[model samples]
Target: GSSGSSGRTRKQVACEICGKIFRDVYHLNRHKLSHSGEKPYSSGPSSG
Candidate 1:
């Protein structure tokens, strides 16, 4: 008989773009946006 406790209780979220699974839905949402080809973070005009 096999017996083991539930290691992961949180529901995993996967990215359709790359099939990447994240521990949290929040992380998955942010990761999926990367495939949208848009940079939400702006480095700003600091680099010369």
Candidate 2:
């Protein structure tokens, strides 16, 4: 009967680059990549 409703959730992670805090691990991981100059999505060709 050990539900995760006792306020015992995972710790909040802070981003070293932007100093932003995240409640989930995945968000924190993505935020950390910002510091490494990595983009999650590729840019499309110019429409000029």
Candidate 3:
């Protein structure tokens, strides 16, 4: 009763700039911004 099933298929989220595959939408979005130099989620410091 401990055999591997391996019967589930997850969705794929790929990057448009580098063609890198991410686990989900957020990962893909974060990766995309990494290439565009945009950080909309930076809210820890008080500098630009």
Candidate 4:
């Protein structure tokens, strides 16, 4: 059996502006849409 592991642990990031926790800012600087808003990203289709 091979038991190799990457030297990395899972963690979460939080926004002080809104106490919104995100899975690793991974800091491509993906900011939440609203202040103090979870702002779970969502979008509608184009207009006809």
TM-score of each: 0.42, 0.40, 0.43, 0.34
Relative to the true structure, candidate 4 has a C-alpha RMSD (angstroms) of 9.5
- As a whole number from 0 to 100, the lDDT of residue 10 in candidate 1 is 56
List model 2 lDDT by residue over 10-34, tens digit each: 5777676667778878877776665
Q: Which stretches of model 4 miss by more than 4 angstroms?
A: 1-10, 32-48
Candidate that beats the other on lDDT, 2 or 4, i.e. the better one: 2
On residues 1-48, what C-alpha lDDT tens digit does candidate 4 reach at each position? Answer: 666776556476767775566777774155753333454546765577
Q: Mind giving the per-residue lDDT tens digits that candidate 3 earns over 1-48?
A: 767878657687877677777789977766666687654867676777
lDDT, candidate 1, at 18: 79
Name the better of 1 and 2 by lDDT. Answer: 1
Provide the overall lDDT of each model, using Cα atoms, as 2-decimal numbers: 0.72, 0.70, 0.73, 0.60
Best by TM-score: 3
For model 3, what is the alpha-carbon lDDT of residue 39? Answer: 48
